[PDB]
Design a protein around this ligand. Structure first.
Ligand SMILES: O=c1nc2n(c3ccccc13)CC[C@@H]2CN1CCCCC1
Length: 111
């Protein structure tokens, strides 16, 4: 029922990305939390090879499967690239992926 020190440090890097807010308090995390089902957006699953969202990321961290931080980063990094593939470069999701990308990386250097 407990959480390894590595788990507690993956939760921290996870939570900072989720809770990041822009200059007038919007949470960029919102659109990325969870994808609509295959039945509700087949185009996404037919155009993006390996679909990723944050609660799916959450289910492996809280459950067990990340050996270090950069292991979790690559599913985050992967998720963003998916968003930036499916959405056009000037789209909002696209830039929020970009901004959150740096947050993830700004957080990890802080160890
Ligand atoms: O790449 C992604 N793209 C989208 N979501 C995501 C949610 C979690 C992870 C990736 C993505 C939310 C759906 C959304 C894209 N959005 C779908 C409706 C039409 C406008 C674009």
């Amino acid at each position: 029922k407990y959480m390894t020190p590595m788990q507690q440090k993956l939760n921290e890097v996870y939570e900072a990305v989720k809770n990041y807010t822009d200059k007038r308090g919007r949470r960029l995390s919102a659109i990325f939390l969870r994808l609509p089902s295959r039945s509700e957006l087949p185009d996404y699953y037919l155009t993006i090879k390996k679909p990723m969202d944050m609660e799916k990321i959450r289910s492996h961290m809280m459950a067990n499967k990340y050996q270090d931080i950069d292991s979790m980063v690559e599913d985050f990094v992967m998720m963003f690239n998916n968003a930036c593939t499916y959405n056009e470069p000037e789209s909002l999701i696209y830039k929020d992926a970009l901004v959150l990308h740096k947050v993830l990386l700004e957080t990890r250097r802080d160890l």
